[PDB]
């Protein structure tokens with residue numbers, strides 16, 4: 552005496568189902584990354600130049616200590 | 623008292639290696655939306671012990687067609703070299719202080735390939751022979767570029783002594799001066815340790831098991847131990863070479879903690895790379911190393927020779 556009951560889609564329909572590709576760009580420009588790399592290299596070069604000059608001075612100092620002790 | 627130091631070096635490395643396998647299984651699992659070993663002990667902490675005990679209580683077999691002497695010799699050479707290559711590493715002090723530690727490490731690396739070669743040849747199987755020939759091709763691919771990268775980087779250090787690398791990077795990491803070479807160096811390490819995407823000597827999906835297809839139980843476990851030890855060792859060498867920890871002569875444990883953390887980060891990066899990429903074809907690896915890595919490496923070697931003279935920044939200790 553009841554209505555016919557069956558597995559049916561809801562009245563109206565279903566919400567949209569996405570199927571198309573989604574691969575967003577999400578990236579910097581090439582110039583930006585190249586510039587960051589070059590700037591990092593230059594900063595490292597300057598730091599290493601200072602440190603190596605100081606190291607050469609220290610080496611000279613301890614070499615002179617050896618020279619003083621040699622006789 | 624020196625033997626105590628040798629043991630305190632080698633035993634923790636093996637323990638570390640055993641646990642490394644557990645970490646990789648878990649890291650790979652969580653990157654693959656699963657868990658990895660979490661049943662054998664709390665969080666799978668007993669899994670490496672169970673694996674070792676299973677492997678060393680299983681029957682080893684000698685193939686009927688195999689050459690017994692070389693078959694037995696190869697895993698011993700592999701594991702002994704993997705243990706030996708840790709002795710010059712400054713952490714911050716080395717067990718063996720060498721004037722030329724980098725060259726010693728290069729020579730021992732070159733000798734390590736013969737374990738793979740002789741195991742593949744003495745197995746007297748076709749897949750093992752294919753794996754051994756792939757190892758030959760891999761060495762031919764990476765060796766020269768790796769050596770020239772090392773030379774170019776060490777031009778800023780002033781010598782081949784590993785401990786001097788601590789003094790060179792006192793204020794800044796060497797990567798900030800040589801980040802291009804570093805990338806190439808990283809790739810070379812991936813090719814040096816036969817790790818994905820350059821896991822060609824084994825090549826499970828192509829050669830079943832490659833050079834070690836005929837090995838079972840303890841010798842196979844020794845090959846595995848040697849390979850993972852080499853992975854950890856090369857990542858430690860990279861951390862010392864490019865990410866210089868500050869060293870306090872009165873508090874060396876600070877350097878030890880910094881160095882260990884950097885090494886663990888690099889090893890986890892290796893596991894991540896294995897989880898992320900497909901496998902190269904072993905001719906494409908040679909083409910990559912000889913047509914892309916070698917020209918840039920030669921140009922950068924030229925530049926790094928010219929740079930200290932240009933800027934008057936030549937390091938001491940001729």
Ligand SMILES: CCCCCCCC/C=C\CCCCCCCC(=O)O[C@H](COC(=O)CCCCCCC/C=C/CCCCCCCC)COP(=O)(O)OCCN
Pocket residue numbers: 588589592802803804805806808809812819860864895910914915918925
């Ligand atoms: C003012 C003067 C300054 C001096 C100049 C400085 C500027 C330098 C500019 C160039 C720098 C480039 C450095 C990179 C060197 C190699 C790059 C390269 O081009 O290689 C690729 C390939 O390189 C790769 O793809 C590598 C494959 C292996 C991947 C394994 C994992 C990737 C690693 C991920 C993280 C990397 C982290 C490295 C550093 C870690 C810290 C040590 C070429 O291959 P193909 O694209 O197939 O083309 C060939 C035919 N034309």
